[PDB]
Amino acid sequence: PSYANAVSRAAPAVANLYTTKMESSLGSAVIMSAEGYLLTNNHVTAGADQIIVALRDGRETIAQLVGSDPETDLAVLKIDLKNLPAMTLGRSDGIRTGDVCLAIGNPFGVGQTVTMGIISATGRNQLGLNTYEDFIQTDAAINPGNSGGALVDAAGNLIGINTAIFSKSGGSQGIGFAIPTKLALEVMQSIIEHGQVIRGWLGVEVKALTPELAESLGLGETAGIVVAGVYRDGPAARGGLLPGDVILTIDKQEASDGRRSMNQVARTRPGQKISIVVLRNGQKVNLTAEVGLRPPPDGGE
Amino acid sequence: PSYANAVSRAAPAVANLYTTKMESSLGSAVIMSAEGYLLTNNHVTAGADQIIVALRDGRETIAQLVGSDPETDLAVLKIDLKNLPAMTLGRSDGIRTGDVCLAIGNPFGVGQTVTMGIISATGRNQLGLNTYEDFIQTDAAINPGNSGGALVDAAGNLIGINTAIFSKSGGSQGIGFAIPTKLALEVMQSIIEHGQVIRGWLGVEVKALTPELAESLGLGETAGIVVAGVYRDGPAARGGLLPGDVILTIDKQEASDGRRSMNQVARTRPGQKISIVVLRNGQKVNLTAEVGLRPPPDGGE
Amino acid sequence: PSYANAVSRAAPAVANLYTTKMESSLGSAVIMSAEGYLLTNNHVTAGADQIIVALRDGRETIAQLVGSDPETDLAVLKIDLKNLPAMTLGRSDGIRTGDVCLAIGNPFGVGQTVTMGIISATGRNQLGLNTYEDFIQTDAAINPGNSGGALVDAAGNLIGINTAIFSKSGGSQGIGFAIPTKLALEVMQSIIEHGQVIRGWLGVEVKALTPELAESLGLGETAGIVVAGVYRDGPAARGGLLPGDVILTIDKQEASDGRRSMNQVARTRPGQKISIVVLRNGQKVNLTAEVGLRPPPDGGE
């Protein structure tokens, strides 16, 4: 049929980013509210000395950088303009593979461009682009210049911020990646509020069972987070875990997935303490621990 | 759903071009009428010593070159065959970004190929491929061998002639460009009639305000075509404009856009004269001028 | 609209192939029946010393290789697992160019991936990838890692096994190729039964009229298979055909197309004999001949 109505709704709220540093770079950004806050990638505006925002209706203006979060590759901007169009929000949770989506951006500086595809996959982590990833995968053509633009559903509602691609040729081969809205709103709100995103710290480093040793004290591969390693300071080595310890629950929640344990720990405010039960030599042992702060640290492959 | 009905309507009127020069090249062409006239790109048939047309139903024949227009990258051909299928025409004006479209061509000589996408953008000029550009942008996969084939809407009606692509890899990365039908019919009809396209000549060369000097005698950036440069002969330097002059109206029409002024001047028949009012030192001055002829002069990036 | 329902139906029956040889390789495979038989490409599992099958629901298991057929680039596998989901079958015959289709695979090892396109063309032979080709062409993004996965119609029914691509860049440029289901079932059933595919042998090698000599004894290019060449042993040179002979019918069937004559001969069981009438010097001559066995012998361009 036609996706023009979706385009008409959403394209006004997607902007072209021109940045100058010390040299010149292109990207995209999404207008989140009529008050002038804009969402984009960190690798678009990082180190810029000047950010110009060019809107679909032709106005241009310099943008102020509210703040940035490199661990998710997001950044926030504020512009002083009246009568701004604002993107409507979709539900990242409600999307399904095979749903149709639209990417809106400035690929190769050609101008605002709409590309069409489907959701290829949801929840892509383990990719190796950012510390925290819940990537939406799409086959809508996404190219250098699409960063920070909008991935939008068939009705025009924002489902993601286009950030990266996997490609052998430096341009689209049908495998592109967008940060889900629900994740991007979380990051956007703290930045707007605290100029950054505050995460919690915990020494432990973990891996899967690979259950030859874990076959010992055998279970169905249920609720076991294997521990390997510790770190230099503000450590969780002084709360009771050791290399080889295995964690059934963190803050009374299953350690089935090591990705989830990253998330809970980041969302626990710095300066607090917490309880983890790991299985040592065949019996549940109970620990409790503090919470440190996390220290400070489009894209191809 | 399915675009097969669209394919069934349109594909019979799209032909495979094989050309030999002095060596061998592939392209596509569109059958515009049952009398055997065919539309294609200039860079497909330019310098060919022999053009073969192969139709979907298997017939082949040598084509005669009616004429060509390199400034838009169009060419016209005539074949002697009976019972030719003819492409139906869509309205280039009525297309909207997000509308679905189909590209029909011979990419890499693989054979007639249908690809599907959306209109990514309309009215693309400033690209740097041709002197006169009103490009439709699509993300339907377009590759070398697609030149001169049909961009068609969801019902099968011709909206454009696929001509070029932007790509880092020598093949499709989702950014392809088609010449709108309405423009291609204009060029097609004079070629068929006068063996070429006759345009009008005028010395002036222009640019935008960049209103630091124009901020002087300030206006809203309204109806001002900045002049910079003049040319060697049949000049419009002998009608009254000078470097630095600024033009509010050409032939009683606004100079808001320098692209439009190119178009009016090309469409004014050679041997006539015309009136332009530019703003000199703060007051409207009125000039009038003659019209010279324009002298004589798929694609990647 | 949305293809999610199609994805939900089909994706459970598409598996990720990891193979180790002597080193490591990725591909895809399709679960054809609840008894654990799987279809994939030959170039994915050929020479593997170990094949792991990873299902959408997370189970993994080593696969046994039933057998393989390199002349079509198909291979078959058997896994020992209960409650397997099974792909539903579409009709390769009923597909039309422009129909929507979905490709399901593991491109670049990113994980199970759904891409969307249309049927670009059907019946692609002469490509030069395999001896026997009836390729479905699609513009659904297909990349290295998609081999042996499912090309599926808009309702979720298998129409093809994704096997190859044409590309200048080592990744998708919109021209991908799937083996039709109807062909793949034929190959699958003999492999499952006889561990291989048994074809018949016949010396002759043929080409088109190119009717300068054939213009002699002129006909409409109807039912004429030109002969050129013969072979080393178990030949059909001892049944009566010679270089230059022209064949009107094979086994009382028209030689209009040399591709069809390949097919009839392969499908004639070894050890039998057959009748071919070729036109020699202007009169139909009738031969009859035996049938030899055929001897033994994702992908880019």
Residue numbers in the entry:
A (entry chain A), B (entry chain A), C (entry chain A): 53 to 74, 103 to 377, 386 to 389
What does the paper say about this structure?
AlgW, a membrane-bound periplasmic serine protease belonging to the HtrA protein family, is a key regulator of the regulated intramembrane proteolysis (RIP) pathway and is responsible for transmitting the envelope stress signals in Pseudomonas aeruginosa. The AlgW PDZ domain senses and binds the C-terminal of mis-localized outer membrane proteins (OMPs) or periplasmic protein MucE, leading to catalytic activation of the protease domain. HtrA protease is characterized by its trypsin-like catalytic domain and regulatory PDZ domain; the catalytic triad was surrounded by several loops (L1, L2, L3, LD, LA) but, usually, in an inactive mode, and could be activated by sensing a specific molecular stimulus. The catalytic triad (H123, D153, and S227) sites are located between two β-barrels and are surrounded by activation loops L1 to L3, LD, and LA (named according to DegS nomenclature).
Protein samples were mixed with two types of peptide activator (tripeptide WVF, decapeptide SVRDELRWVF) prior to crystallization trials, yielding four complex structures, AlgW-tripeptide, AlgWS227A-tripeptide, AlgW-decapeptide, and AlgWS227A-decapeptide, with resolutions from 1.8 to 2.6 Å. AlgW-tripeptide and AlgWS227A-tripeptide crystals belong to the P6322 space group. The AlgW trimer could be generated by symmetry operation, and similar to most HtrA protease, this funnel-like trimeric organization is mainly mediated by the N-terminal protease domains. Because of the high flexibility, our AlgW-tripeptide and AlgWS227A-tripeptide structures, as well as many HtrA protease structures, lack the LA loops. AlgW and DegS share similar hydrophobic environments to accommodate the large side chains of aromatic residues 0 and –2 (for instance, WVF for AlgW and YQF for DegS) in peptide activators. Consistently, AlgW-peptide bound structures also demonstrated different interdomain orientations, in which the joint angles of the PDZ relative to the protease domain are AlgW-WVF (25.62°) < AlgWS227A-WVF (25.74°) < AlgW-decapeptide (25.47 to 26.48°; average, 26.13°) < AlgWS227A-decapeptide (26.65°). Thus, by recognizing additional C-terminal residues of the targeting protein, the PDZ domain of AlgW adopts a more open form and maintains a more stable state, generating stronger substrate cleavage activity. This is in accordance with our enzymatic assay in which the tripeptide-bound AlgW is partially activated, while the decapeptide-bound structures reflect the further activation of AlgW.
